[PDB]
Amino acid sequence: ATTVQLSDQSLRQLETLAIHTAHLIQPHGLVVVLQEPDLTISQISANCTGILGRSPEDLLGRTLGEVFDSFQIDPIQSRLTAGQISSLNPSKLWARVMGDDFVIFDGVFHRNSDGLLVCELEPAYTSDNLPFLGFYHMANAALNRLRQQANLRDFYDVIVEEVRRMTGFDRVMLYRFDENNHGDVIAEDKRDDMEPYLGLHYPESDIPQPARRLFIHNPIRVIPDVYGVAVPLTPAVNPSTNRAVDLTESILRSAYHCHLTFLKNMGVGASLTISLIKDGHLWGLIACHHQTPKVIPFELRKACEFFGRVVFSNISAQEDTETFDYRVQLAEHEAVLLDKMTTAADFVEGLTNHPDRLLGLTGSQGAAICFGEKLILVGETPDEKAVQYLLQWLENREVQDVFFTSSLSQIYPDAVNFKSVASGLLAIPIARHNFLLWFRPEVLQTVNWGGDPNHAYEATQEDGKIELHPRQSFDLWKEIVRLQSLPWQSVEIQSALALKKAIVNLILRQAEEHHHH
Amino acid sequence: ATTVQLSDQSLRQLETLAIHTAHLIQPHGLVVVLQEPDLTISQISANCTGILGRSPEDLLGRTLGEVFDSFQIDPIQSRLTAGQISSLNPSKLWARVMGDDFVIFDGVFHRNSDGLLVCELEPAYTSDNLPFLGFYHMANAALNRLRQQANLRDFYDVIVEEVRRMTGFDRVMLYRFDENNHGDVIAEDKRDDMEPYLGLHYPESDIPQPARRLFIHNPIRVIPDVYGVAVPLTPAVNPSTNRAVDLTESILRSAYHCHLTFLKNMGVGASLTISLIKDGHLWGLIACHHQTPKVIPFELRKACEFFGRVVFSNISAQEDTETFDYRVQLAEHEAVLLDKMTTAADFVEGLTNHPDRLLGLTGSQGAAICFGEKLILVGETPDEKAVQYLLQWLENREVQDVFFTSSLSQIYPDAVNFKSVASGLLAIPIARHNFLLWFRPEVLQTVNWGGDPNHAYEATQEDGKIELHPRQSFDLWKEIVRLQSLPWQSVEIQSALALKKAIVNLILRQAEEHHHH
Ligand SMILES: *[C@H](C)[C@H]1/C(=C/c2[nH]c(/C=C3N=C(/C=C4\NC(=O)C(CC)=C4C)C(C)=C\3CCC(=O)O)c(CCC(=O)O)c2C)NC(=O)[C@@H]1C
Ligand SMILES: *[C@H](C)[C@H]1/C(=C/c2[nH]c(/C=C3N=C(/C=C4\NC(=O)C(CC)=C4C)C(C)=C\3CCC(=O)O)c(CCC(=O)O)c2C)NC(=O)[C@@H]1C
């Protein structure tokens, strides 16, 4: 009711939101919390009335066998084991309703963080319309081709194309988290009449810390009907804990209202989201949208997850391989320089005679060799005077092992005047008083924000309670990044460091030879 | 002095051995522990006398700058940062000894678990004989070929072949830890006149828990001279903690004596060991042996580690891809069965008409369909009577979601009589009273132990102290494993489970149709 300016309180409310203990359940399925070994129903979603014709009053304190028939759930005397649970997934359960009616579910069990058994019953449309056993062969062929020859981009595209082929989703995206946990849509496959989100960048707050954390424990989220009105667990608290049941790993947990409102604003009728995890860190999501409601049965979700994770394993290997390959390319430059340096009369002469190697060593476009009295400028550099003032600035600030920046202007303001040749600077001190410098030009870089980063959500405060809402503007923002070079890669800096080392060895060997001899 | 029978006390002594706080240092290099910001020497290895001509009495309490000249170690006012440290690695330091002498080191710094700065000085033979910049190109080409077409075995071989090419080691092995942390030598490249360890299996105690733990924190261990007599840190305790310095991440930490004795027994003069880590778990080691002493400088070790880890990243992807590919092959079998099952008059007829699909579904060689009154035997099975007794045994033991074993004889002893067709059994209950069974024959499997598993080391007790020694027998043992089938793979069990599910759906759909109609 009261429009609240975006605050520190509204941001730390967002990052601490207890979404995992929400008690609201998506209305197409039943959640039953079960006390072992009898499988006594201790909580049940209130949609049991409409689905089963039996109220929570009729069901709480009954055993699961009194409510459902099944083939595979026997009465056993101790708590269900992890292996037992995973083999129950999914299992057919059915109830006889009104009189002349089967209602058939596929049930999926898990034990939550506090040891409570949770059973989730999704309607079984036996096997009605979404095969993937055959589509697995097309997905496998696609992966096989990538493994023959591919860029990283080809892997991204295969994930989105094959998940969309298998599922029939109107839109499938690959969403990658960056260093600040902003998101980038790095691949997309969608209907031709839908607008592209490919290349769009989103604030960290769109998928906040509790949502990201959830995806580390729970690989898959599905919402088959965004407009489904959520129903409560009854009671809202678990009888044995007296507290809300932890639904981190729940299929049928209804999403936090603000995310639902976000999807509704976007015209999304159904979604499927699968996480890609590396070394316990959330790397990204396969994010699928449909414009209308859409059921994705458990086996199909698991097939998409299996394929996506096998492709992702191949993406890690591809990233590591490209890094190695680039290091090897740079090692050639290093080796040629060391060969010519130690062969020349004077080692600076060796360097100057091989400028494409010297520049190639760090992926750069200009360089300066400053040794003793001489200053040699190679490739595209600032003019001699500017380099001298820059050298002087580097000398006056306590000599690190290396200085590098991809936007020199914002720590050295006079660099605005040579932004077209040296927005980027890599400076290595050699024997204290000397320097090798490498230079890179401005490259304009555009961040295509999918919403306003400075107005990333909406907050209201009623009765002391802060409420948070998705942003109401659909405008796009492009941030045009200027005075910035391409970034320095770790292997380029290491290659530069390796040249420094080789020069230092030369100087020491020459000092040792003019002592001994 | 007193021969001690191998015990629980000697085994838990082995698993709790504090190797990381050993104060003995390999004699070719110096260790200095340094107090910041002055870099005051608080401990030093006692070989400083011979290497520098200066005793610990002369050095303790001096700053590093009083002892060594360098280009890159400046006096700075706060503790060295992680980025500063890693750029110092390696840095040239040199001392002037006797009078007319340089002694030159490459120094490598780290901050240990307790915040102490440790500097390790290995002699610099500038760049004297072991290039790898060029060999990186051959290693890269080898990796490139694997990525075009390869089995897992090809990846193992590339690691050992290229590390050996780059290093010149007499023997290079890939050592993989199994589920019990026994080791298997799964690849090897060695001089033709040396005996092969390829295919040998070793007890967990050969590389005990403290050694494995060390490799999670410290990727590389090197011992350039196994016969080098280790020298103490002086003092043996750090002045600021009053306790032994944690040398987990130390290059020059001398190995525990029993491992040295092991290497000496094996004729090893030098070693290099690089760990391969996945998801915080130690997967395996690249283990290199030379028959004589051998220096492997820091940069070469890091090059081997980088290559080995890039190949290992590709090995994870290959393992995931082969698993996926096998699941897809099995999914074809599943799909054909479901198609023929739902098309036949009766679904058992569908199964029986496609026996290569039914067997192929689980990688098995025989099967039994037991539904209601009929029992159909497919492929190589036990005789009808034996299958009936087995069915009866399965019925009497509370029905899991699945029973599988790769050695039926050791829980069902009468299975010894049909070991050639059903050493392995996969049994799935369907609708409670029915079963699908799959059968597999005995396949003899040999474990080539590299030493006696029942006498895996030697223990003595003198004066209350238990001492442990490497085993003294060089005999090999082969364990010939009998009455055992090939193991059931997870994807084969899942495929069988998927058939069960499909049959259950059929039965429910037929029960629903004969109710409604
Ligand atoms: C409202 C308070 C704020 C908010 C909160 C919020 N977000 C989520 C979860 C997700 N948000 C997304 C984001 C996107 N999906 C997309 O397709 C795109 C376009 C490329 C975006 C930006 C996604 C994928 C999730 C994961 C959940 C899912 O089912 O996919 C949570 C999670 C809530 C839950 O209960 O599970 C919350 C609380 N989001 C906003 O818009 C506001 C800033
Ligand atoms: C003596 C008490 C027991 C023992 C202890 C022990 N072992 C190690 C470390 C290693 N052992 C090996 C084992 C092998 N290397 C090989 O090439 C082969 C043949 C294939 C084997 C079996 C290896 C590779 C290591 C790692 C250390 C390394 O430098 O390579 C430790 C570690 C000690 C340390 O201080 O670092 C200890 C205490 N080993 C025995 O033989 C006895 C059972």
Ligand code: NA
């Ligand atoms: Na019942």
Ligand code: NA
């Ligand atoms: Na962009």
Ligand code: NA
């Ligand atoms: Na000095």
Ligand code: NA
């Ligand atoms: Na063997």
